[PDB]
Amino acid sequence: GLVPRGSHMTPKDDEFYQQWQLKYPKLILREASSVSEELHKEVQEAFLTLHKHGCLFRDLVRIQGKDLLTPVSRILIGNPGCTYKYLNTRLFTVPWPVKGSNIKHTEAEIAAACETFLKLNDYLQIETIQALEELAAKEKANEDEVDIKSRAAYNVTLLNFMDPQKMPYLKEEPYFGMGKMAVSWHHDENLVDRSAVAVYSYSCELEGRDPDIWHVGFKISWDIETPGLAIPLHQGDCYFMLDDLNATHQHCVLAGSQPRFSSTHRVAECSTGTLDYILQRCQLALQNVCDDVDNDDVSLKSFEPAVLKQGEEIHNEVEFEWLRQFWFQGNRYRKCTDWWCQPMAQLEALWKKMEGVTNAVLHEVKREGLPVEQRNEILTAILASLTARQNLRREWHARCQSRIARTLPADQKPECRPYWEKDDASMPLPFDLTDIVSELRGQLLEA
Ligand SMILES: O=C(O)CNC(=O)c1nc(Cl)c2ccccc2c1O
Numbered sequence: 001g002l003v004p005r006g007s008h009m010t011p012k013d014d015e016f017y018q019q020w021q022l023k024y025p026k027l028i029l030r031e032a033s034s035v036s037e038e039l040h041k042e043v044q045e046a047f048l049t050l051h052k053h054g055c056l057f058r059d060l061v062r063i064q065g066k067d068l069l070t071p072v073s074r075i076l077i078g079n080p081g082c083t084y085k086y087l088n089t090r091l092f093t094v095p096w097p098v099k100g101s102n103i104k105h106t107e108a109e110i111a112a113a114c115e116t117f118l119k120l121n122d123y124l125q126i127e128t129i130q131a132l133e134e135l136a137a138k139e140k141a142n143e144d145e146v147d148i149k150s151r152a153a154y155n156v157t158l159l160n161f162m163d164p165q166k167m168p169y170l171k172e173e174p175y176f177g178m179g180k181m182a183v184s185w186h187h188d189e190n191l192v193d194r195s196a197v198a199v200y201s202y203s204c205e206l207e208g209r210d211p212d213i214w215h216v217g218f219k220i221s222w223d224i225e226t227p228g229l230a231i232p233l234h235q236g237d238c239y240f241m242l243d244d245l246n247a248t249h250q251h252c253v254l255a256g257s258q259p260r261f262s263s264t265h266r267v268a269e270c271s272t273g274t275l276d277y278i279l280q281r282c283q284l285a286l287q288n289v290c291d292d293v294d295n296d297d298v299s300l301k302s303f304e305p306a307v308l309k310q311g312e313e314i315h316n317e318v319e320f321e322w323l324r325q326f327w328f329q330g331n332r333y334r335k336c337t338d339w340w341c342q343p344m345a346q347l348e349a350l351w352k353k354m355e356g357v358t359n360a361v362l363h364e365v366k367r368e369g370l371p372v373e374q375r376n377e378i379l380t381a382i383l384a385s386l387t388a389r390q391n392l393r394r395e396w397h398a399r400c401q402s403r404i405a406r407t408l409p410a411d412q413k414p415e416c417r418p419y420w421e422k423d424d425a426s427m428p429l430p431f432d433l434t435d436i437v438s439e440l441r442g443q444l445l446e447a
């Protein structure tokens with residue numbers, strides 16, 4: 001009555017190394033020994049420094065339609081202006097000193113910790129490039145270099161902390177008997193295609209895997225028959241997911257007994273995920289506006305269907321992918337940096353102008369001498385956007401009010417911003433668009 005595994009291998013197993021070579025050869029390990037002790041010291045002090053200053057936060061994430069606080073605490077450090085979205089939650093970088101950077105005030109050591117993980121970034125990048133080089137050499141032996149450079153060009157690291165003591169609510173691994181999970185089976189999302197990932201692991205201080213020691217687990221996608229690998233991690237071990245590993249396999253993190261930090265360096269796919277990018281989108285939308293002076297008499301250059309559609313889509317993007325994402329996190333990074341404070345003021349102001357634009361379009365649609373054909377063209381151009389705007393607003397209000405969110409501290413409690421009451425003359429349109437959307441449809445049905 002024995003079947004395909006339902007089991008896992010560790011180094012305690014003879015088959016371990018050969019299974020590693022045959023079924024997970026794009027997973028690479030570099031033991032703590034291969035990293036200079038000086039770098040170890042700076043990186044671990046930087047972990048503890050960011051921990052004492054309270055810079056790591058559990059994210060109020062979303063999964064299969066459920067609001068869930070993560071057991072693990074996190075901070076995103078990386079290129080200025082860059083974001084990384086996972087589980088419907090866009091993390092904004094705490095900036096690190098990339099060349100030609102602006103020294104935006106931060107707590108004393110905080111900036112020095114960010115500088116440190118930049119240093120670790122450079123290092124791991126060198127290692128990753130070396131390993132992909134070696135990997136290709138094997139490839140050509142048995143059977144571009146710009147591709148390598150870019151698949152290793154880490155623009156962010158996502159730091160994680162868990163204390164299994166003060167966070168004892170951990171799920172059991174369901175397929176292979178690997179025990180307690182800090183992070184369940186997953187692929188890392190929103191990374192550049194075929195990009196590598198590098199993880200520096202930092203633990204503080206018989207059948208199957210040792211439950212007291214931290215491991216990273218690996219399995220093949222769709223496959224619980226091939227035995228999973230449970231890799232032991234100690235103080236300063238590094239692992240690397242190369243090439244298509246992250247796509248073809250899943251990984252998890254198995255909890256040990258002691259606290260542990262990790263630094264997971266990534267090539268975030270940020271083509272719609274940078275400040276410069278969303279600023280350019282806002283400028284594009286506002287091209288349709290007469291911009292001599294900034295005031296409330298917003299007047300539009302064209303009502304061509306395509307230009308209005310584009311404008312209302314950009315309105316949506318800045319509102320929900322940026323403003324609401326930033327403020328849903330209650331301004332926690334204000335604890336680490338001020339970098340995003342002016343950028344978010346400026347995006348909020350660009351957004352307010354856009355509430356202005358929408359209003360202008362709604363006045364036009366209701367205009368006396370407007371041939372009903374052109375009117376119908378406008379409605380059909382904008383209706384999808386306005387309806388998606390209304391639904392996404394209902395969802396963010398709720399997500400800000402969930403019973404789980406109200407239980408967060410005052411430093412991290414969500415902020416449903418921007419938000420205004422119906423008795424607010426400062427804003428040209430109501431927050432609740434259901435009336436407006438209904439009317440627009442009733443018209444499009446009109447004989
Ligand atoms: O800490 C580690 O060794 C590895 N960390 C992660 O692999 C990791 N990556 C992602 Cl994208 C998520 C995403 C959501 C929750 C946990 C994650 C996680 O632990």
Ligand SMILES: [Zn+2]
Pocket residue numbers: 186187188251
């Ligand atoms: Zn992961």
